[PDB]
Specification:
Elements (H helix, E strand, L loop, with lengths): L13 E5 L5 E5 L1 H4 L3 E7 L5 H20 L4 E6 L3 H9 L7 E5 L4 H5 L3 E4 L5 E4 L2 E6 L2 E7 L10 H5 L3
Parallel strand pairs: 3-4, 4-5
Antiparallel strand pairs: 1-2, 3-8, 6-7, 8-9
Length: 162
């Protein structure tokens, strides 16, 4: 696939997470995003430095501002399994609004055209870093990095065009 772009319809797919009683759930992407304005941001890896100290904290810190400007859900996707994503979410006890979603087989990431080859670096195939603004399945903003750098995909850069 070519990278998803502004004006495209967001594809469906299945993502995994733990519920409040600590049970494994798997739901569709459209079950979390249809009929509403959302942000979906992608990271190359749970527990990696840029993702963990810069990219995710930006969303937690700006969540209030973003929700006051119409955002109804803020979803973080990674090519990691839901066991790892549960441990990663627990490292942010401060976080009430970011949902951590698991695409650990990279299926949804390839449907977005956002696969990234990190074989040499020791992470296998992951997602490119990115942030999308999506309003009832229509992509309104698509801020997509080449690889895992951090230049266009911050919370601040989605906020500024809301």
């Amino acid at each position: 696939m070519a990278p998803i772009a502004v004006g495209d319809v967001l594809p469906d797919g299945k993502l995994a997470y733990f519920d409040e009683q600590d049970q494994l759930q798997e739901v569709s992407v459209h079950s979390l995003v249809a009929g509403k304005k959302v942000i979906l941001f992608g990271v190359p890896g749970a527990f990696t430095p840029t993702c963990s100290l810069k990219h995710v904290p930006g969303f937690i810190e700006k969540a209030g501002e973003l929700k006051s400007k119409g955002v109804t859900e803020i979803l973080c996707i990674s090519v990691n399994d839901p066991f790892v994503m549960k441990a990663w979410a627990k490292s942010y006890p401060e976080n009430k609004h970011v949902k951590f979603l698991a695409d650990g087989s990279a299926t949804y990431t390839h449907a977005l055209g956002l696969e990234l080859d990190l074989q040499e670096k020791g992470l296998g195939t992951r997602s490119r870093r990115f942030a999308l603004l999506v309003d009832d399945l229509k992509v309104k903003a698509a801020n997509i990095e080449g690889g895992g750098e951090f230049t266009v995909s911050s919370a601040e850069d989605i906020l500024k065009d809301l």
